[PDB]
Scaffold this motif. Structure first.
Motif, short mmCIF file in Angstrom:
data_model
loop_
_atom_site.label_atom_id
_atom_site.label_comp_id
_atom_site.label_asym_id
_atom_site.label_seq_id
_atom_site.Cartn_x
_atom_site.Cartn_y
_atom_site.Cartn_z
N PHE A 541 0.84 -1.19 0.00
CA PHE A 541 0.00 0.00 0.00
C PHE A 541 0.88 1.24 0.00
O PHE A 541 1.92 1.27 0.66
N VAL A 542 0.46 2.26 -0.75
CA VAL A 542 1.21 3.50 -0.91
C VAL A 542 0.60 4.55 0.01
O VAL A 542 -0.52 5.02 -0.22
N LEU A 543 1.35 4.94 1.04
CA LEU A 543 0.90 5.95 1.99
C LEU A 543 1.24 7.37 1.58
O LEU A 543 0.66 8.31 2.13
N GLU A 544 2.17 7.56 0.65
CA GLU A 544 2.72 8.89 0.40
C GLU A 544 1.76 9.81 -0.35
O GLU A 544 1.96 11.03 -0.32
N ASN A 545 0.74 9.28 -1.01
CA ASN A 545 -0.21 10.10 -1.75
C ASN A 545 -1.61 9.52 -1.60
O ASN A 545 -1.81 8.42 -1.07
N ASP A 546 -2.60 10.28 -2.07
CA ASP A 546 -4.00 9.94 -1.85
C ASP A 546 -4.54 8.92 -2.83
O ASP A 546 -5.58 8.31 -2.56
N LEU A 547 -3.87 8.72 -3.97
CA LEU A 547 -4.48 7.95 -5.05
C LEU A 547 -4.78 6.51 -4.65
O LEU A 547 -5.79 5.94 -5.07
N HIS A 548 -3.92 5.90 -3.84
CA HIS A 548 -4.15 4.51 -3.45
C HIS A 548 -5.20 4.34 -2.37
O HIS A 548 -5.56 3.19 -2.08
N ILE A 549 -5.68 5.41 -1.75
CA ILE A 549 -6.91 5.32 -0.97
C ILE A 549 -8.13 5.61 -1.82
O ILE A 549 -9.16 4.94 -1.69
N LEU A 550 -8.05 6.61 -2.70
CA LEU A 550 -9.16 6.91 -3.60
C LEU A 550 -9.50 5.72 -4.49
O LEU A 550 -10.67 5.50 -4.80
N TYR A 551 -8.50 4.94 -4.91
CA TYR A 551 -8.84 3.75 -5.69
C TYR A 551 -9.66 2.76 -4.88
O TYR A 551 -10.46 2.02 -5.45
N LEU A 552 -9.48 2.73 -3.57
CA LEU A 552 -10.27 1.82 -2.75
C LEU A 552 -11.63 2.41 -2.39
O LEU A 552 -12.60 1.67 -2.24
N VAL A 553 -11.70 3.74 -2.26
CA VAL A 553 -12.95 4.41 -1.91
C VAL A 553 -13.79 4.87 -3.10
O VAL A 553 -15.00 5.08 -2.94
N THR A 554 -13.21 4.98 -4.29
CA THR A 554 -13.98 5.53 -5.41
C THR A 554 -15.16 4.63 -5.75
O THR A 554 -15.05 3.40 -5.72
N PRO A 555 -16.33 5.22 -6.03
CA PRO A 555 -17.52 4.43 -6.35
C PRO A 555 -17.33 3.46 -7.51
O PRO A 555 -16.67 3.77 -8.50
N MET A 556 -17.94 2.29 -7.37
CA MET A 556 -18.15 1.39 -8.49
C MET A 556 -19.25 1.92 -9.39
O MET A 556 -20.35 2.23 -8.92
N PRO A 576 3.01 11.08 -12.63
CA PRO A 576 4.30 11.04 -11.92
C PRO A 576 4.55 9.67 -11.30
O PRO A 576 3.62 8.95 -10.95
N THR A 577 5.83 9.32 -11.20
CA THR A 577 6.21 8.02 -10.64
C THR A 577 5.68 7.83 -9.21
O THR A 577 5.36 6.71 -8.82
N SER A 578 5.57 8.92 -8.44
CA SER A 578 4.84 8.89 -7.17
C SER A 578 3.46 8.25 -7.29
O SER A 578 3.06 7.46 -6.44
N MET A 579 2.72 8.60 -8.34
CA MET A 579 1.38 8.07 -8.58
C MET A 579 1.34 6.95 -9.60
O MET A 579 0.42 6.13 -9.57
N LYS A 580 2.30 6.92 -10.52
CA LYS A 580 2.43 5.78 -11.42
C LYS A 580 2.79 4.50 -10.66
O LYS A 580 2.46 3.40 -11.12
N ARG A 581 3.45 4.63 -9.51
CA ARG A 581 3.62 3.49 -8.61
C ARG A 581 2.29 2.92 -8.14
O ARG A 581 2.10 1.69 -8.13
N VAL A 582 1.35 3.78 -7.76
CA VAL A 582 0.01 3.32 -7.38
C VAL A 582 -0.64 2.54 -8.51
O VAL A 582 -1.23 1.47 -8.30
N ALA A 583 -0.55 3.06 -9.74
CA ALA A 583 -1.09 2.35 -10.89
C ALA A 583 -0.47 0.97 -11.06
O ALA A 583 -1.16 0.02 -11.44
N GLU A 584 0.84 0.84 -10.81
CA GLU A 584 1.47 -0.47 -10.87
C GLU A 584 0.88 -1.45 -9.86
O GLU A 584 0.63 -2.61 -10.18
#
Lengths: 787, 787
Positions: A541-556, A576-584
């Motif tokens: 899990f990526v704590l450094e940015n919001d995207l990896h929580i939004l992916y879990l909370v974003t509506p289906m 950015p690689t900060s957020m491209k890491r989340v995509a990986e």
DNA sequence: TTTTTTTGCCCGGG
DNA sequence: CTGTGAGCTTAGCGTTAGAGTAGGTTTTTTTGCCCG
């Protein structure tokens, strides 16, 4: 007697009904209330034309039963708008009696727990949620009445079948002991072919009427021929206004009645087609005072106040509405912001607007009467119009009392004529249950959820109890393979770990994944997706940015918008690689993005369905990230293609999904992940503290930057003009979460530039400069605010 | 007057002195109290031998100042043990007057904020921490006194230099306040040379004495002869019980005084040799009685209790103490668990043990007087013994009222004899501050810290302030390179982000990384590892298991053990994939471990200063994971090569790191990391709850696997014998966090296989079996309880 | 050739 | 699947996007502390 005062109501309620301008019942309301056992507590189902005082019967039955018995009455409604409308209306009736009226709807919920209420108004999903809580608390004894509006919804597989599940659970758990009626149900419905079977299913008294205060003339226009419902030719149409390129003369159909100050409503197949016809009709009406026929009075100084109110709104006045609204023409579809919808509907309700193009959104969940309804085609979205939707549309015809008659014209081609007539001379289909399998078919998701809600609720723990529940369904009442459908559901629920096969006969109990699905009120088909994401976050899990929580909370969603997979693919490659890491980690993959741009959108499989679901969920995460990243809305519209109406549908659903997936983690016992989610939920509150909007006057402050200057030193802009530029620099530099501008060893400089960039401001400035510019801006504001 | 009653003490404390000690001060104490300015509040340094009445003057000065000046003292002691002893002592001495004595030491801290206390008895590391918190809170005016022991520690690079910083900050802030004292410093020291310099730095009076109630007859034994400190020959040796078993005849030098009913304390270089040599001496008391000067009086009426008091311990009676303790022979070293040492402290203080071999743990930090000290060699480890250790080891020679003269015997070979004479006739080196650079040397980390603490506390903002501070250090006195050291530190801080540079010359401020380093009271040189591990773990955090959050809270040490790299590699190859992922995501690398198997020592660079320091921290996390997995310590010590005395210090230290790094991550602002660490903190606690402790023994239940029963309500073995096996099965299945058994798509089979292992108890059982056996084992134990 | 001992932080229930 | 208008903005013409709707818990304002 028809006079309502003779029914002995408590005078406060009678005086409120008089203040609402209703003093006499209609004959059908007396006949319905005088059905002998209904006042004794027998179940009731009644079908009457919409509006037309339909709910007055249910309101009087609630009023008596909540006064005769202190038990609570539950009022279930299909949509949040009509739920809120009925809540405030019922409050104005009953609050003087001392009755506590509140409800569950949208993000609104009661100010104090369900114990405090006497009448609850709620949506279908809030109702089915509340019942599961009353079952788990074993406080089902509290429930004294359940009033269901639009009881014909039982066949809607997407939502509304929950209205069958809800009433089956109320019946089963009551009759489990009752074998004087404990929970009186009232249904309100349509003129269904098999309404008496629904009444028999509920063991209810049946009443049905055709009375409506304003009679409705259905008609078809076929070329110039106008046919009545019996296909008698009433007119050959003559267009009072000749129009370029128009074969159907819709503008003449509007103008013909506008000549008498009667408003028109025009249902169009699509958002684009509404705007096109609101533009055209406005351009024709603009010509009238140049070219002139009777005069049109528009009260334009009122439309100035209407159109100014659109200018006040942060949406701004829409560029089509600039053209149409001065002439009393509007359009109304779901792509508008909700405040724009309220302004447009309100201007129609006051009679300032006189022609209103709309999509189906004025058929379902909004009540706006007009003298003449026009339906632009019998084909909608490349399919024939549903007869239920048509009969809802035409029911908009006629203002109570103001109109002597309501009129409806279906516009039709001569090539369409048969498909046109089939809507007038046809009728509603029989209501049927979504629990019914086809013979060749997997046992339906509505049945699987039906069985889950008892087992996990602590009711009907054995298959003997489940069959005694299942025979209470409207599926059973409709039928008098099904005996095997229950054991197919438990086989499916076991194979997907929703229930425990306790043994020595067998007994079934909830797993945590059961109680999680139930307590979050997700579909079993959603928790197969949400869990397979949330379990994949636990692995890394990526704590450094919001995207990896939004992916879990974003509506289906399925097709929340059309997705331009190329602009998504390019926007992913830009990440950015900060957020491209989340995509990986989330599982966005170059091979699937490339196939989405190059190919036809790929077909589903066991693997490829979730693979698609990840990407569609991830794209919706970026939009939701940009909303929390404080991108101006006007940009996001260009950046992804989602209009400003869809964005509010996403802001509403995302906040609620944070609460749901917090609780989903609690029931799973993942109290670490749950504490991350519960603390993120504090940040999906998009509501602006308008007290901070003074600091938002200077261009260099985002809401956080304002709040940290509101927090540190309580800066008014009048005081920011007085601040030390180095003190502002210090207060900014020590407000941010620390990110090292140094590279760490065995990083790559990609990551280091991003940590630096994440502290640069506009990417273009640093605090050592920006702290001077903001003090200069504040004194440039102040010297203008003083004048 | 030497009679204490004339000094005007409060009678409660006077009678406590009469109870605890003696009515007359020693002759020197009336001199040291009457250095004319000391009683006026002048700072004071004094030295008196080997704790022989040492602290009474300081304690009397505290009592005067705290009663009459009514401000809050701070008593700084080199060890928690000494601090614990002194806390109860100063409580029991003062508490009847209402002096709110408490203290900060180890995990122990006062029940209330500092403002409630009157004496804060304190360790060094926690006294510096408390001084920082006073500075940051600007509460430094509250401090009324500091009292200091072993003030000769200032020359230690590893510890105690903190005592220079602490007194410098007191002097610096006092001078900034002054530019009868605001703070009185009382410092207690060894009889150093250049002690006048230490006294001159503190602007203090000086006292020195050699007074002893019991004189020390120093000597050296060489070649079967004995020589005085003055190299006078005392006698040729008189070996009795002479045996080939150890040709230095240690057994003779012990038994020769045992005949007098006086005890032998035998310092040896190492635990392995210390513990071995106590076994040899025990065999000679065996050899006497099994062949029976008199045989040793064993007093077994008490040894047969004390020796069983060890059997009651969670590690039993030690497998060598079984052999020696029946004879009154023991050994005491920091490889024993803490309780074994505390018991042996009792058995020696009561004199039930008469021979006690030791390592240096009895040299410093605990006071066990014995008539004859024996020191087995001039060499300790690989080097000659430190004369500061020797003069403390031989300081154990006298007990005020029990015996008349103390003795010591260093044992040397005939070769290397001069190595011993240099210990007998030597004296301590002059103390020199660790702030002192060599001219060619990169500036020392204790200077860098000294510069940091004044910036982050904000009392020194500029390059001029830091040259003004440096003139208050003890380095400044020692030098009458300082010009280049201060600026070279401010550079080194900048290039590691601990500080920020602003204009209006340059002016410096802390980053968040400054305040995090200071508030955790970590060393700056350690924070560059701890922060690098946090920064690399805001990426890719594995929430599935604790091993990653252990790695972030694992204490970091220089060779906390020797690490057997081959056994570590055999662990790393064998971890669960859910944990081998955590190894990779902190940089543990197969090729690096292969290198460390191929060779332990290499040239290095800051990449390799990480690599060889990541793995050493991870190996320590494996041990902590086993402790919280409740693995048997008999296995742990075999599995890793650690030993049971270290493990208990790691349990205490890890419970500290989890509480420091929560404050670290708080003050970086990484709040989404703080609320993970602050949650795991609650689980680093190895004791048992008030009511569980009797239950958790029975039916082979782990602490929480038992606690989940009691979490349902109070339960006992008699209750666990009644519960239904299916009821317990559901209770157990409700206890675990959910871990699905299904393989996900895009997952490896080995990755799900662990989730179906993590469910099992242990012989691996599912609850269908274990929930029966738990009741059957409970009822069968109940059948042994009832009889 | 292996090998001595030592220390940091926060707050609970009410 | 089936269906059509107006679609793009190229220059005057071809052929495509396209309705609206719902879920969750917890639940208000302020300094200072004292005891297992």
């Amino acid at each position: 007697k028809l006079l309502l005062a003779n029914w002995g109501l408590p005078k406060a309620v009678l005086e409120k009904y008089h203040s609402f301008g209703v003093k006499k019942m209609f004959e059908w309301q007396a006949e319905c209330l005088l059905l002998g056992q209904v006042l004794e507590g027998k179940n009731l189902v009644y079908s009457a034309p919409t509006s037309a005082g339909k709910t007055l019967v249910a309101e009087l039955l609630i009023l008596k039963r909540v006064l005769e018995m202190r038990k609570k009455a539950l009022f279930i409604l299909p949509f949040v708008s009509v739920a809120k409308e009925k809540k405030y209306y019922l409050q104005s009736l009953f609050q003087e009696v001392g009755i506590k009226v509140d409800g569950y709807m949208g993000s609104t919920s009661p100010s104090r727990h369900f114990s405090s209420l006497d009448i609850a108004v709620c949506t279908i999903e809030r109702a089915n949620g509340l019942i599961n809580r009353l079952i788990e608390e074993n406080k089902m004894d509290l429930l004294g009445m359940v009033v269901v509006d639009e009881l014909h919804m039982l066949g809607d597989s997407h939502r509304g079948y929950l209205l069958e599940l809800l009433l089956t659970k109320i019946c089963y758990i009551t009759r489990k002991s009752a074998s004087s009626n404990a929970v009186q149900i009232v249904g309100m419905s349509a003129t269904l072919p098999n309404l008496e079977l629904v009444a028999s299913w509920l063991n209810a008294e049946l009443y049905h009427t055709d009375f409506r205060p304003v009679p409705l003339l259905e008609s078809v226009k076929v070329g110039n021929s106008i046919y009545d419902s019996s296909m008698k030719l009433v007119r050959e149409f003559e267009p009072m206004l000749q129009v370029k390129g128009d074969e159907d003369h819709v503008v003449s159909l509007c103008y013909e009645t506008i000549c008498d100050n009667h408003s028109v409503l025009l249902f169009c197949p699509s958002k684009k087609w509404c705007e096109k016809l609101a533009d055209i009709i406005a351009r024709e009406f603009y010509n009238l005072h140049h070219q002139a026929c009777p005069p049109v009075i528009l009260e334009q100084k009122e439309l100035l106040e209407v159109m100014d109110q659109l200018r006040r709104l942060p949406s701004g006045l829409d560029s089509v509405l600039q053209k149409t609204v001065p002439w009393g023409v509007a359009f109304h579809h779901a792509g508008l912001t909700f405040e724009e919808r309220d302004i447009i509907e309100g201007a129609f309700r006051q009679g300032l607007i006189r022609v209103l193009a709309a999509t189906s959104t004025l058929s379902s969940g909004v009540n706006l009467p007009a003298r003449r309804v026009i339906i632009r085609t019998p084909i909608f979205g490349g399919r024939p119009l549903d007869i239920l939707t048509y009969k809802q549309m035409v029911g908009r015809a006629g203002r109570k009392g103001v109109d002597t008659v309501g009129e409806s014209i279906l516009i039709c081609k001569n090539s369409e004529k048969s498909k046109g007539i089939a809507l007038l001379q046809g009728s509603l289909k029989p209501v049927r249950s979504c629990l019914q399998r086809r013979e060749g078919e997997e046992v339906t998701g509505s049945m699987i959820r039906a069985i889950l809600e008892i087992i996990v609720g602590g009711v009907a723990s054995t298959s003997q109890d489940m069959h005694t529940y299942a025979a209470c369904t409207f599926l059973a009442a409709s039928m008098k393979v099904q005996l095997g459908a229950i054991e197919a559901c438990v086989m499916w629920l076991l194979e997907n770990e929703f229930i425990q096969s306790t043994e020595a006969g067998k007994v079934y109990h909830p797993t945590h994944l059961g109680s999680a699905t139930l307590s979050s009120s997700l579909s079993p088909a959603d928790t197969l997706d949400i869990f397979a994401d949330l379990q994949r976050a636990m692995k890394g899990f990526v704590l450094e940015n919001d995207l990896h929580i939004l992916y879990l909370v974003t509506p289906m969603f399925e097709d929340w918008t059309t997705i331009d997979w190329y602009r998504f693919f390019c926007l992913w490659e830009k990440l950015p690689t900060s957020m491209k890491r989340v995509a990986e980690l989330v599982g966005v993959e170059e091979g699937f993005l490339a196939r989405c741009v190059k190919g036809k959108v790929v077909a589903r499989t066991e693997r490829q369905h979730r693979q698609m679901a990840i990407h569609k969920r991830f794209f919706t995460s970026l939009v939701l990230l940009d909303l929390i990243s404080e991108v101006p809305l006007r940009e996001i519209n260009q950046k992804y293609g989602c209009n400003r109406g869809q964005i509010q549908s996403l802001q509403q659903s995302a906040a609620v999904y944070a609460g749901m997936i917090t609780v989903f983690s609690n029931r799973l016992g993942w109290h670490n992940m749950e504490l991350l989610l519960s603390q993120f939920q504090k940040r999906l509150t998009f509501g602006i503290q308008r007290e901070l909007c003074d600091l938002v006057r200077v261009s260099l402050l985002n809401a956080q930057r304002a709040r940290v200057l509101y927090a540190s030193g309580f800066h008014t802009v009048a005081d920011l003009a007085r601040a030390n530029i180095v003190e502002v620099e210090v207060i900014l530099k020590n407000a941010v979460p620390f990110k090292s501008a140094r590279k760490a060893v065995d990083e790559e400089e990609e990551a280091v530039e991003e940590r630096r960039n994440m502290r640069t401001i506009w990417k273009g400035l640093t605090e050592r400069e920006a702290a001077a510019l903001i003090v200069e801006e504040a004194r440039m504001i102040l010297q203008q605010d003083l004048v």
